[PDB]
Amino acid sequence: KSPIFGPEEVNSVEGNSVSITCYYPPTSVNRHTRKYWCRQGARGGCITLISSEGYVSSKYAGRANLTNFPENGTFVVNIAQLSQDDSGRYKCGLGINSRGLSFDVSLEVSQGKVYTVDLGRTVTINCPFKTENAQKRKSLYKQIGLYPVLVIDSSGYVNPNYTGRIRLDFSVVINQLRLSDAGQYLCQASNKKNADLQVLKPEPELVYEDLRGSVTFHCALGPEVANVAKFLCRQSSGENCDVVVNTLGKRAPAFEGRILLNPQDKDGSFSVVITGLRKEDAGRYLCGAHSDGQLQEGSPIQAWQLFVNEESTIPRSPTVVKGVAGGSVAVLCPYNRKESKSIKYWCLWEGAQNGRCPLLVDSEGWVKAQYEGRLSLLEEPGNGTFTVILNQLTSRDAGFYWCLTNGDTLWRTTVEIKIIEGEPNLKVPGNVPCHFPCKFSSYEKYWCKWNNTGCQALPSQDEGPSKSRLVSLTLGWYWCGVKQGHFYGETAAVY
């Protein structure tokens, strides 16, 4: 369908300006075509209300603006002087109206002591007191059925509905409010005075990401709730948070290896990283600490509306590169051609929830304990990718590996290494044996002297298939591997 993404549903009060941002896949055509904001008329197609090419309608004359941000890949339509008439179904898109490439935005304008807080957040209500009497008999009162049906006992006992979260003094403070808790409570002190309580579900922070890419969520919840365990939903049709990742330890089965969770900062703001996004990742992701993990009411939450573009510039990456135990592999990791590398970090996964990646190698050349020697990263194929290798086929190495870079567009492409025991394609350990099958020998079996800084080729048996390869250093860690030239085939570990 259309790769255009915007607010599925805006809303506002009359006389208040609204800003609607629509995301489109950044390409030259998309950056230079017409950007249109039309209104789906009841019978008849769009009547174009505003366009990027200087057009504005009968209305939206001096009320509206349409700015195009090609670099961001977006366009923002601003509508001022909103009215009850300006409510209905609109479309924001590119090119021709009768053409598809668009997104549907449902705009609704609502007619224009109050305390408005998010669900599961602190709030307090004031109730004026007559000072002529020292303390008249007062309690809390609720607006349900024309008469405050007992909501707080005058003795101080908490109602079953408002249990264990209310304190009374005239100030009453209640925290962890659910959606149904708020109401225009009429409190008396009998001196009756009005009040208002409002709960608003936080608006989702739209995130438009690409297929075969990575996304990051920043759950900056209030510090207070900070220490309570946090989680990350994925909101379905009916209210059921298919919990994806949890601070407590819960993990989603179809998200293994990939997802990494940053530890909580000083406050309570941790980031969740997802990689290898697919078309089924499109949906509302809801944060929320509330120890249990399941998104249950009365908890501070933060929302995101991820949209995965199905027309992505990220090229295909081989998802799995399984190999022979004692042999070697080759992992070609794509990166942004525009911005060249800074640090080619290469990682592992601890789990499906924690998953703190362990930079096996870096552009400097620092290597981990078990991969000290038996692992390398070799820039070329320079044109916007590279090739990290890992010889000497240990089993334990099975898992998922991330091709990190500290450039800009941070795709953290993931690759699965399925190791299988079998015949090794090249020969053994030196002192200097080496062997690769004749079918695999169409290339040029080579030797390198292993350096964590840079692989440098050195002389060995440089002939035809000889038993097939071999290594000679007639007069450390060394590599005896096949090379395609541009790209590279497997390795060989000699001492």
Partner 1 sequence: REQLNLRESATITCLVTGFSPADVFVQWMQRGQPLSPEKYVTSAPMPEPQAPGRYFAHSILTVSEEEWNTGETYTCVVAHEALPNRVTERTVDKSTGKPTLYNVSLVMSDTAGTCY
Partner 2 sequence: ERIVLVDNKCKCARITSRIIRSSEDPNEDIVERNIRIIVPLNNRENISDPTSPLRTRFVYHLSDLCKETCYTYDRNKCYTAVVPLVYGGETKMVETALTPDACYPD
Binding site for partner 2 (CB under 8 A): 27-29, 31-34, 95
100 contact, one of partner 1, partner 2, none, CB 5-8 Å limit per kind: partner 1
Q: Does 53 bind partner 1 (CB under 8 A)?
A: yes
What is the C-alpha separation between 323 and 330, in angstroms, rounded?
Answer: 9
Query: Among the candidate windows 47-55, 126-134, 144-152, 218-226, which touches partner 1 by CB under 8 A?
Result: 47-55
Q: Does 69 bind partner 1 (CB under 8 A)?
A: no
- Beta pairing class for 419-420 and 414-417: unpaired
Q: Does 238 bind partner 1 (CB under 8 A)?
A: no
CB 98, min distance to partner 1, A: 3
What is the C-alpha separation between 393 and 420, in angstroms, rounded?
Answer: 9
Asked whether 351 and 257 are in contact (CB, 8 A), the reply is no
Q: Does 223 bind partner 1 (CB under 8 A)?
A: no
Q: Tell me whether residue 55 or residue 366 sits nearer to partner 1 (CB atom).
A: 55
Which of 330, 495, 333 has the alpha carbon at shortest distance from 425? 330
2 contact, one of partner 1, partner 2, none, CB 5-8 Å limit per kind: partner 1
CB 174, min distance to partner 1, A: 49
Give the three-state DSSP class for 22: strand
CB 1, min distance to partner 1, A: 7
CB 100, min distance to partner 1, A: 3
Q: What is the largest CA-CA distance in the chain?
A: 108
53 contact, one of partner 1, partner 2, none, CB 5-8 Å limit per kind: partner 1
Which residues, 83 to 102, sit near partner 1 by CB under 8 A? Answer: 96-102
Query: Among the candidate windows 18-26, 50-58, 338-346, 368-376, which touches partner 1 by CB under 8 A?
Result: 50-58
Q: Which residues contact 433 (CB under 8 A, 6 or more apart)?
A: 427, 470, 471, 494
Query: Among the candidate windows 52-60, 170-178, 250-258, 318-326, which touches partner 1 by CB under 8 A?
Result: 52-60
Q: Does 27 bind partner 1 (CB under 8 A)?
A: no
Q: Does 2 bind partner 1 (CB under 8 A)?
A: yes
CB 36, min distance to partner 2, A: 13
CB 48, min distance to partner 2, A: 16
Q: Mind giving me the DSSP string for 402-464?
A: EB--SSSS----EEEE-EE----SS------EE---TTGGGS-EEEEE--SS--EE-----SS
Query: How far from each other are the two terminal CA atoms of the chain, in whole angstroms?
Result: 56
CB 9, min distance to partner 2, A: 25
Of the candidates 15, 16, 41, 55, which one interacts with partner 1 according to CB under 8 A?
55
For CA atoms 274, 275, 276, 277, give the dihedral sign. Answer: positive
Q: 373 to each of 155, 174, 446, how far by Cα in Å?
A: 74, 60, 17
137 contact, one of partner 1, partner 2, none, CB 5-8 Å limit per kind: none
Q: Tell me whether residue 73 or residue 429 sits nearer to partner 1 (CB atom).
A: 73
Asked whether 413 and 400 are in contact (CB, 8 A), the reply is no
Give the DSSP H/E element, type plus range, for residue 331: strand 331-332
437 contact, one of partner 1, partner 2, none, CB 5-8 Å limit per kind: none
Half-sphere exposure of 408 (CA within 13 A, CB side): 5
Tokens of 370: 């078990």
> Left if phi > 0, otherwise alpha if psi is -120 to 50, otherwise beta: which for 144?
beta
Give the DSSP H/E element, type plus range, for residue 226: helix 223-226
1 contact, one of partner 1, partner 2, none, CB 5-8 Å limit per kind: partner 1
CB 4, min distance to partner 1, A: 9
Q: Tell me whether residue 60 or residue 411 sits nearer to partner 1 (CB atom).
A: 60
Q: Does 156 bind partner 1 (CB under 8 A)?
A: no
Q: Tell me whether residue 99 or residue 418 sits nearer to partner 2 (CB atom).
A: 99
Q: Mind giving me the DSSP string for 55-121?
A: -B-SSSTTTEEEEEETTTTEEEEEE-S--TTS-EEEEEEES-GGG--EEEEEEEEE---EEEEETT-
Query: Among the candidate windows 51-59, 238-246, 318-326, 446-454, which touches partner 1 by CB under 8 A?
Result: 51-59
CB 320, min distance to partner 1, A: 28
Which residues, 319 to 378, sit near partner 1 by CB under 8 A? Answer: none
How many residues would you count in the chain? 495
Q: Which residues contact 170 (CB under 8 A, 6 or more apart)?
A: 126, 127, 128, 129, 138, 187, 189
487 contact, one of partner 1, partner 2, none, CB 5-8 Å limit per kind: none
Q: Tell me whether residue 310 or residue 462 sits nearer to partner 1 (CB atom).
A: 310
What is the C-alpha separation between 285 and 233, in angstroms, rounded?
Answer: 5
Q: Does 58 bind partner 1 (CB under 8 A)?
A: no
Residues that bind partner 1 (CB under 8 A): 1-2, 44-45, 53-55, 96-102
